[PDB]
Design a protein around this nucleic acid. Structure first.
Ligand SMILES: [Zn+2]
Lengths: 113, 128, 99, 204, 145, 60, 80
RNA sequence: AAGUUGGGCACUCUAAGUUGACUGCCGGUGACAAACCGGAGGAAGGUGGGGAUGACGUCAAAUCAUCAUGCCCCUUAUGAUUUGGGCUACACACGUGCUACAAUGGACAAUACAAAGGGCAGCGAAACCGCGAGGUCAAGCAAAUCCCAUAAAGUUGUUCUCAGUUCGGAUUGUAGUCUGCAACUCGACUACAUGAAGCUGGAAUCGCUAGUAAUCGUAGAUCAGCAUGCUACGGUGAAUACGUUC
RNA sequence: AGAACCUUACCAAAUCUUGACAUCCUUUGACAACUCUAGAGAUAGAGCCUUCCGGACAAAGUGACAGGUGGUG
C-alpha cells in the first residue's frame, strides 16, 4: 500500500507500482532505481525498509488525488476563460483538432442513430 | 589447392561457392554455416547435393553469398554446391539432375501493377 | 596521370558509338585506353493518371533512362588532349572530361 | 481507347524530336524548345511545315525544319530564313542555326494530309470527298495503307459523329511498323472538327 | 466453365522425419509465412507427445491422422453424400487437427497440438468429434447419393 | 487556369512559403512535376509527341 | 514562434498599438485581424475586437488568458 | 579496424552485342491431322513468368474546372487586389483503409540477411549536447566513389503466465523539438502522466490459382512542413481447384 | 503526385475600373529593387536614385480592347 492505494501482491514491484495513478512504467523504473530495489522482486516478497524508501521517493512525485485535482483545475480554467478548447470540453468533442464528421466516438459517447 | 568453383542463384541471392578437399566444414562469409543460417533445415538442404553425389563430408565449402534473405542465400549456396560438384566430376550430372538441384529456380517477385494493391491483390469491391 | 571521360546519354546506341569514336581517337593519338566501362543505368519512372478527370485506377508509366559510360586514358599526350577537345559528338550525349 | 501510335513508337523505332541532354536546367531547356516550336508553328502556318527537330550543343540550337514547301520558308534570296533566324536569336539568347529539309511526296506525309483536309473542311468542302481523294492519291503514290477520320459536327449538324475511310494495311499493333500519324483541327463556323490520319508506307 | 483438373503441388519430405504428412502439417500450422515458428511449434509438440506417451511420435501422429480422417462427406446441391478422395482425407485430417488444437484451452500451441494429437490417437478428440458428425450426417443423407 | 491566377503565381510573393508551382504550358496547379515544370496531362501529350528528350513509355 | 528559442510571436503593429496609450487609463478597443498573435501580460485589461471572418468579436483580456492566441476567443464556425 | 592500398580482372557484378525455347526430339490418346498427356535433353517446356499493346462497336457514360472550342451570359462586375475565415463543421447512414482484441504473443538485451529509388544550396558522415524528437560544429558528395541508410519479420537468452492484463493506445493534461513571417480555427514528431472501446465480430459481403495470397519492413512523386493514400522494391512464404448443379 | 497563408475557384470586410494579364496608338522617360510615415494588409504621401544601346526596354494618358475555374460534355 503506497500513496494510499493498494497494489497487486503477486505482481512484480515495477509493474505493480504503475497501478498508482500518476505512476507509469518509466516513472516506476525511475523510482525503483532511485530507491534501490530489485526489479524482479515481487511486492509480497519485499522488505519494510524497501517499502519505506519507495514511499519516501513516491511522496514527492505529485500523484493520485493531487494530480487529479491539478488536471481538473487546468480543464476548468480553460473552460472558464472561454477558450476554444474550453468550448470543446464543455461540448464533449475532440479538443485537439480532429475531424468530427466521423470517428469521434471516444469523445461523443456511443452512436445515437 | 584443388579448388572447384561455382555460382549459385536464387531470388536475389548470389553465392560464389568453392569446394576444397576437406572434412565437411562449411564457412559462409567467414562464419560457420550453423551460425549464419537460422535453421537446421537450411543446413540439411545445403548438404542434400552432397548426399545425392555420395561425397558427404569429402569437401570443405567456402561461400561468398550476398543478396536476398536467409532461405534465398541458402538455396543459392545449394545451387552453387551442385554446380561445383558438376565441375569436379561430370559423372554426377545425372544424379544431380534427377535430384533437381541443377535447376536455377526462376521464380521471382512479380512487379506491382498500377491500380492494384499488390501484384495480384485488388482493392476490396463494393457494389453500390 | 589519368584522364576520365564520363558520357551520359538517353540512347545506348548513341552513347556506345560516341564511346567507340573517342576510344578510336585516343588510340590514334597514341594514348592507351582502358574501357569503355558501362556504369549502371539510371532509370526514372513517372506514373501519370491517364484520364483527364477521375478514373484513378487507369495509369500510364513513362521512363527516362540515362546510360553512363566511363573511359580512362592512361598515357596522355598533347596530341591526345587536342584531339579529345576538338572532337565533336552527337547532340544527345553529354561528355565530361576530368584531367 | 487507341494508343497514340507516335507515342507508342517513340524510343523504339522512332527517335525523339528533341535531341539533347541536361541534368540541372532540363525544365528551362524544355520550355525554351516549346516556345521555339510554338513560334515556328505560328509563323510558318502557310508553309507546309511537316515537323521540326531541335538539338542543342555548345550553346547552339540546331533546328531542322522538315517542310513540303522549302522555297517558301527559305525565300528567293534567303531573306525569309534569315529573318526567322534573327527572330529566333532575339527570342533566345543562344545562337540558332536553321536547316530546311525537302519533302518530295507531301501526299504521303500524315501531318500535311491532315492540315490539307482540315483546310478544306474550313473551306466547307465535303468531309467524305476530301477523305476519299486523300486516300486515293496516297494509295496511288505507293502507300501500303492509309486511314482517315473526321469527327465533330460534320456538315454543321447538331449531333456530332465521326466517319473514317481506309485502304490497304495499317497494322497499328505491330511495333516494327513505321506508321505516321497526325491530328489536326478545323475551326468551322460550328466549332471544332478533329481530323486524324494514319499512313503506312511499308517496311523500310 | 472449366477446362479440367490442374496439376497438384508436391511437397518435400520433412528434413528430419522425411514425411510428406509432417511437411503438410507444418504448412497448415504456418501463419503469415512464419515457417520457422511452425517448425519449432511442431517439434516441441512432437517432443511433448513422445514424452507423455512413451511411444514413437511418428507412430502416434499416424494413428491420430488415421483416426481423424473421414471417408464420407456431404455437399450442398439438399446435401448429397459422397466419398472423399485419398488426398482430401489427409487435407481434412490435418486441417481439423490444427483447428481444434487451436480451439483447445492449453496455454501454448505446442501443448494444444500435443494434447489434440493424443486425444485423436485415443479416439476422443475434437477432430474425432468432427469426423463422427460428418459421418453421421453422411449416413443420414445416404439416400441422396 | 485563370490568367490572373497565373500572373499572381508568376509575380513575386511577399511571403516565401507562399510560392507554389504551376504547369508552365497550361497552368494546372495540381500534379506538376519539378523536373519538367509540367502537369501530368501536358507531360503525357509531349511524351507522345516525342518532344521530351529520353522520355518514353515504360514497362517491366 | 512556438519554439522556445524564438520568442512568443505577436504582430508588431498589434503590439505597438497596444503599447500606445498605455499610460492613459481610458484604454479603448483595438480592432485586430491578428488571430495568430500571442497574448502577453501587457495585454491584460484590454479589449480587442478580433476578426473571426465576418465581424470583430470583442474579447476582454484577463490574467488566465495570458499565453493563448487571440483567435482562441473568437470562434469561427457556428453550430446550433 | 576496414577491399583500406600495393596489385589483379579470376569470381560476382555492371551494360552493349550475341546463343537459347520453336511442340524442336521420343512414346501414348487422337480420324496417320490439330491438340492433350508423359519422357529425354536443357537454366528454362508447352504463348517459361510478368509488362506495354485494348479491333468493329455499347452506354447523348466522364471531362466546357488541364487545354481548346460553337453558342449564350457578366463587363462600376459573374472581372481584379488584400487580410481573416470556409473547403478540417457533426444528432447521423455508406465505401475504402490503419491499429488491435494477444502466448504462433508483450517487454528487455545481444546478433544477421535484401531489393529498388533520391540527392545542389540538396543528401548532411563522424564528433559533442539532450532520455527524447532534435540542436552546434562539420567531412564527403552533382553519384557503381559520399550520404539518405543499422531494414523489419527472423535467431539466440531473461521475464510476464491466459489476467480488459507487462494486451490494446483512442482520449485528455502538462512540458518540448522542427518547418514556416505565422501551427487558435488547422501540421508532424518527441518526453511524463492519463489508459477508452475492443477478449476475433449478425444479416450479408470482398480479394486471391504461386514466389500468388498472407505477413514484414524499404524507397519515391507531390512537398518549407505534413501520407494509415498512391506508385514501386524486396524478406519469409502457404491452402485449394473434385467439378459446372446453382 | 501534398487546403494554416499560397493553392482556392467559396464566404465577410477594405478596395480598382483599359483593369491582376496581352497587342496596337500619343508623350517620353532614368522603372525600381531600397530605405520613412499611415494602415490587417493590398495601397497613398517626399524624398532619396542607382540604367539605356539610330532603338531595344520601361513608365503616364486615351481608345480599340482585356478578363470569367460563369452556363451548356
Ligand atoms: Zn499542363
Amino acid at each position: 500500500r503506497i500513496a494510499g492505494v493498494d497494489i497487486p501482491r503477486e505482481k512484480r514491484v515495477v509493474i505493480s507500482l504503475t497501478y498508482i495513478y500518476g505512476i507509469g512504467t518509466s516513472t516506476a523504473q525511475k523510482i525503483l532505481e532511485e530507491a534501490n530495489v530489485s526489479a524482479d522482486t515481487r511486492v509480497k516478497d519485499l522488505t519494510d525498509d524497501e517499502l519505506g524508501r519507495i514511499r519516501e521517493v513516491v511522496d514527492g512525485y505529485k500523484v493520485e488525488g493531487d494530480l487529479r485535482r491539478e488536471t481538473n483545475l487546468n480543464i476548468k480554467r480553460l473552460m472558464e476563460i472561454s477558450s476554444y478548447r474550453g468550448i470543446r470540453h464543455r461540448r464533449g468533442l475532440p479538443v485537439r483538432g480532429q475531424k468530427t464528421k466521423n470517428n469521434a466516438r471516444t469523445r461523443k459517447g456511443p452512436v445515437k442513430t | 589447392q584443388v579448388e572447384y568453383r561455382g555460382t549459385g542463384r536464387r531470388k536475389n541471392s548470389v553465392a560464389r561457392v568453392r569446394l576444397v578437399p576437406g572434412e565437411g566444414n562449411i564457412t559462409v562469409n567467414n562464419r560457420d554455416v550453423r551460425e549464419y543460417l537460422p535453421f537446421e533445415s537450411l543446413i540439411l538442404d545445403l548438404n542434400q547435393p552432397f548426399d545425392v553425389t555420395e561425397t558427404k563430408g569429402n569437401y570443405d565449402v567456402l561461400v561468398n553469398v550476398h543478396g536476398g534473405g536467409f532461405t534465398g542465400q541458402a538455396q543459392a549456396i545449394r545451387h552453387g554446391i551442385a554446380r561445383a560438384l558438376l565441375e569436379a566430376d561430370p559423372e554426377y550430372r545425372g544424379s544431380l539432375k534427377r535430384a533437381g538441384l541443377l535447376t536455377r529456380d526462376p521464380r521471382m517477385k512479380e512487379r506491382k501493377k498500377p491500380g492494384l494493391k499488390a501484384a495480384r491483390r485488388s482493392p476490396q469491391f463494393s457494389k453500390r | 596521370q589519368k584522364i576520365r571521360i564520363r558520357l551520359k546519354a538517353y540512347d545506348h546506341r548513341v552513347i556506345d558509338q560516341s564511346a567507340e569514336k573517342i576510344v578510336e581517337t585516343a588510340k590514334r593519338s597514341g594514348a592507351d585506353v582502358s574501357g569503355p566501362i558501362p556504369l549502371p543505368t539510371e532509370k526514372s519512372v513517372y506514373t501519370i493518371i491517364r484520364a483527364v478527370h477521375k478514373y484513378k485506377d487507369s495509369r500510364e508509366q513513362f521512363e527516362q533512362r540515362t546510360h553512363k559510360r566511363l573511359i580512362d586514358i592512361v598515357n596522355p599526350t598533347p596530341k591526345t588532349v587536342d584531339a579529345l577537345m576538338g572532337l565533336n559528338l552527337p547532340s544527345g550525349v553529354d561528355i565530361e572530361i576530368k584531367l | 481507347q487507341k494508343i497514340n501510335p507516335i507515342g507508342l513508337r517513340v524510343g523504339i523505332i522512332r527517335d525523339w524530336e528533341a535531341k539533347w541532354y541536361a541534368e540541372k536546367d532540363f525544365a528551362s531547356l524544355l520550355h525554351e524548345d516549346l516556345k521555339i516550336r510554338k513560334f515556328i508553328d505560328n509563323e510558318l502556318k502557310e508553309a507546309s511545315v511537316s515537323h521540326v527537330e531541335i538539338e542543342r550543343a555548345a550553346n547552339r540550337i540546331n533546328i531542322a525544319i522538315h517542310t513540303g514547301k522549302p522555297g517558301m520558308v527559305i525565300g528567293k534570296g534567303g531573306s525569309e530564313i534569315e529573318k526567322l533566324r534573327n527572330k529566333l536569336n532575339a527570342l533566345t539568347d543562344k545562337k540558332v542555326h536553321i536547316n530546311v529539309i525537302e519533302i518530295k511526296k507531301v501526299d504521303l506525309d500524315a501531318r500535311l494530309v491532315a492540315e490539307n483536309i482540315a483546310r478544306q473542311l474550313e473551306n466547307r468542302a465535303s468531309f467524305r470527298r476530301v477523305q476519299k481523294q486523300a486516300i486515293t492519291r496516297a494509295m496511288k503514290l505507293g502507300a501500303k495503307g492509309i486511314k482517315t477520320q473526321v469527327s465533330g459536327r460534320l456538315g454543321g449538324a447538331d449531333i456530332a459523329r465521326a466517319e473514317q475511310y481506309s485502304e490497304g494495311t495499317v497494322p497499328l499493333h505491330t511495333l516494327r511498323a513505321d506508321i505516321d500519324y497526325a491530328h489536326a483541327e478545323a475551326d468551322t463556323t460550328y466549332g471544332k472538327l478533329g481530323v486524324k490520319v494514319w499512313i503506312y508506307r511499308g517496311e523500310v | 466453365p472449366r477446362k479440367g483438373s490442374v496439376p497438384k503441388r508436391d511437397v518435400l519430405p520433412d528434413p528430419i522425419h522425411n514425411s510428406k504428412l509432417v511437411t503438410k502439417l507444418i504448412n497448415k500450422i504456418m501463419l503469415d509465412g512464419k515457417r520457422g515458428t511452425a517448425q519449432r511449434i511442431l517439434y516441441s509438440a512432437f517432443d511433448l507427445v513422445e514424452q507423455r506417451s512413451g511411444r514413437d511420435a511418428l507412430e502416434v501422429f499416424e494413428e491420430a491422422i488415421n483416426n481423424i480422417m473421414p471417408v464420407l462427406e456431404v455437399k450442398a446441391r439438399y446435401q448429397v453424400p459422397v466419398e472423399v478422395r485419398p488426398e482430401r482425407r489427409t487435407t481434412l485430417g490435418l486441417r481439423w487437427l490444427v483447428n481444434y488444437a487451436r480451439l483447445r484451452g492449453e496455454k501454448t500451441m505446442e501443448d494444444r497440438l500435443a494434447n489434440e494429437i493424443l486425444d485423436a490417437a485415443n479416439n476422443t478428440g475434437g477432430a474425432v468429434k468432427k469426423r463422427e458428425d460428418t459421418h453421421k450426417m453422411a449416413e443420414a443423407n445416404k439416400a441422396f447419393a | 487556369a485563370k490568367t490572373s491566377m497565373v500572373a499572381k503565381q508568376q509575380k513575386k510573393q511577399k511571403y516565401a512559403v507562399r510560392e507554389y508551382t504551376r504547369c508552365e504550358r497550361c497552368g494546372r496547379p495540381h500534379s506538376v512535376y519539378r523536373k519538367f515544370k509540367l502537369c501530368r496531362i501536358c507531360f503525357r501529350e509531349l511524351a507522345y509527341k516525342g518532344q521530351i528528350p529520353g522520355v518514353r513509355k515504360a514497362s517491366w | 514562434a512556438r519554439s522556445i528559442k524564438k520568442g512568443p510571436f505577436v504582430d508588431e503593429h498589434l503590439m505597438k498599438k497596444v503599447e500606445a496609450q498605455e499610460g492613459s487609463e481610458k484604454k479603448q478597443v483595438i480592432k485586430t485581424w491578428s488571430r495568430r498573435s500571442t497574448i502577453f501580460p501587457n495585454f491584460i485589461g484590454h479589449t480587442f475586437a478580433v476578426y473571426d471572418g465576418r465581424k470583430h468579436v470583442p474579447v476582454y483580456v484577463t490574467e488566465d488568458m495570458v499565453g493563448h492566441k487571440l483567435g482562441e476567443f473568437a470562434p469561427t464556425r457556428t453550430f446550433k
